[PDB]
Design a protein around this nucleic acid. Sequence first.
RNA 1: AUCGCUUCUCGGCCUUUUGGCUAAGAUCAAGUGUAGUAUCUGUUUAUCAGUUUAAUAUCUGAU
Lengths: 42, 56, 42, 111
Amino acid sequence: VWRNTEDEILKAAVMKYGKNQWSRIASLLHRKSAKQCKARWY
Amino acid sequence: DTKLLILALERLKEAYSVKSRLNQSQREELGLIEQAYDNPHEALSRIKRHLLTQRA
Amino acid sequence: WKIPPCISNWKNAKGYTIPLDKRLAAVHINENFAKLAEALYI
Amino acid sequence: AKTVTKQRVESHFDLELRAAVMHDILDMMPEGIKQNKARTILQHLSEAWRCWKANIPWKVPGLPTPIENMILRYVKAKADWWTNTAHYNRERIRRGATVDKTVCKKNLGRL
RNA sequence: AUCGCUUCUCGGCCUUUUGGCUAAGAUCAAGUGUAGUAUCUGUUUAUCAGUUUAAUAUCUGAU
């Protein structure tokens, strides 16, 4: 499941890295893979 | 239902016969297959729930 | 003759934060689908 | 003054393409007098190319037309070069001539 | 009204600022149960009676 802390990290991570580096962002997060981050964003 | 499920899961295992260097995602698949091989009715309950309700 | 700057989705050489909006910005359906689908229902 | 051989074909294509672009308009269709920003039009050129490759429709909000036509022309140049090389290498791979292992992977990615 | 000084406000520059290329260059992340090791951290309750002991101590008992 998704916790507000995490997706608030994801907003900032996407704001910084860009909308195509999902593996970087996925690395910012513990217990998330790049597929799930990309899914949650889209 | 359990015979059809055993056949499905054996077929899916047949990919990683080698038990190679695989990855995270195949690791996760093997996890799902094993826990459905152990507890075959939560599996089938999930399966029919999917077939009934999911369309995206 | 002013040239807008590029904000790419792949390169962030200096690691700069850009808001989602400015990061972001830089469908048809025929009418025969109706005739086909309704002919099928009939 | 070393020749252009086989490991420097791509890097050299890009050297000469962006030298050409810098000659082309950013010094011969200017009148963005102050500082004609050519170092930033080159950034647009590289990004238009990545957008071609990703199949994204690329449209920059307020960008003078002569520049946009220059960029579209040069991205079509590089696209022709890229896919003609793909056709050529695919024929070599199919009939059996090269065993190089970077060309096999580069070509699978192109196609 | 004019000149000068100061205070605040606003506009304009603000290219003076995103090192090039390819097969987005390529790829991916698992864990604390057991022990131990090391480092810090703390230390070497007040009599008296006895037991004890080479002497201490210990032990026992009220504080």
